[model samples]
Target: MKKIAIFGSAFNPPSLGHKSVIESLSHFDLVLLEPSINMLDYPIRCKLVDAFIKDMGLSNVQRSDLEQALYVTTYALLEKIQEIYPTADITFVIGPDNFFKFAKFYKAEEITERWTVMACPEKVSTDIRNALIEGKDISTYTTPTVSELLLNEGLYRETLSGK
Candidate 1:
């Protein structure tokens, strides 16, 4: 089975933290960097994104229009994810804020039943943990492993060289 790590974020500046998170989860066959709708509109920030990609030695970043409604919804975001990784086993990486509000999203059941979701531990609060454990309107899912590498040191020459 193809294991895909989905890193959905604003990626506003594509910081070192983002790079570290993606690299730490790179054991998967594919890593998807998904940007939210609002994040898609800014052109200036793309420079930072480009630099991050260069640092990682990645070429041709990708995006999806599924979440581009006048009001971007979680369901739309999930749809885009479903399309890109239709047959692949997905690990949806998210932060605390989104995880807590996940259940309230439209068509959430469709996503919950289909994919394996993962969240960052540092951001997941006690309330979020309780909400997930209690299974309140959400399907059971596994948490993502915490990343050990710090944000600043993810850039290795080889990883950047595409060798």
Candidate 2:
């Protein structure tokens, strides 16, 4: 049997908290990061996540491109994933705010019944977007490579986009 952990988020730029969360789940057979493609900066977000995950030495953690073509609702996304991992027992990985707001998700109860849902650290840090906009040192919030690229590339300089 396979134990899979699925994470879908803005991943606008993956952070230290994000790394810690994924690191904690190293035991899972597969930990997939399905980036949200709705933002105009979708490609940047994907690159940020890919760079963050690269050479992490955790072969289990991977950035998935499933959302690029077949994306949909959370419930719908998992439905398709299930076909690929039929023997997999999947868990939805989320932050504290979203976990508290889980009832607001589509088919919340059905997802809870069919699979597992979890939130770690009691909270996920925010305002990193603003930090990036203001050109502050995001070492406290972001992983090394992610912070470096964001600063050098000037993606969120002096203003925010794709809110």
lDDT tens per residue, model 2, 25-66: 878999999988613277778888888888355789988777
Taken over the whole model, the C-alpha lDDT of each candidate is 0.50, 0.78
Model 1, 80-152: lDDT tens per residue?
Answer: 6667668877777766567788787677777778777776544112332243335342111111211111112
Distance (Å) between predicted and true CA of 138, model 1? 38
* TM-score, every prediction: 0.55, 0.87
Segments of candidate 2 deviating more than 4 angstroms:
38-40, 122-126, 158-163
lDDT of 2 at 83: 81
Which pairs clash in model 1?
Answer: none
Best by TM-score: 2
After superposition on all CA atoms, how large is the RMSD of candidate 1? 13.3
TM-score of model 1 relative to the true fold?
0.55
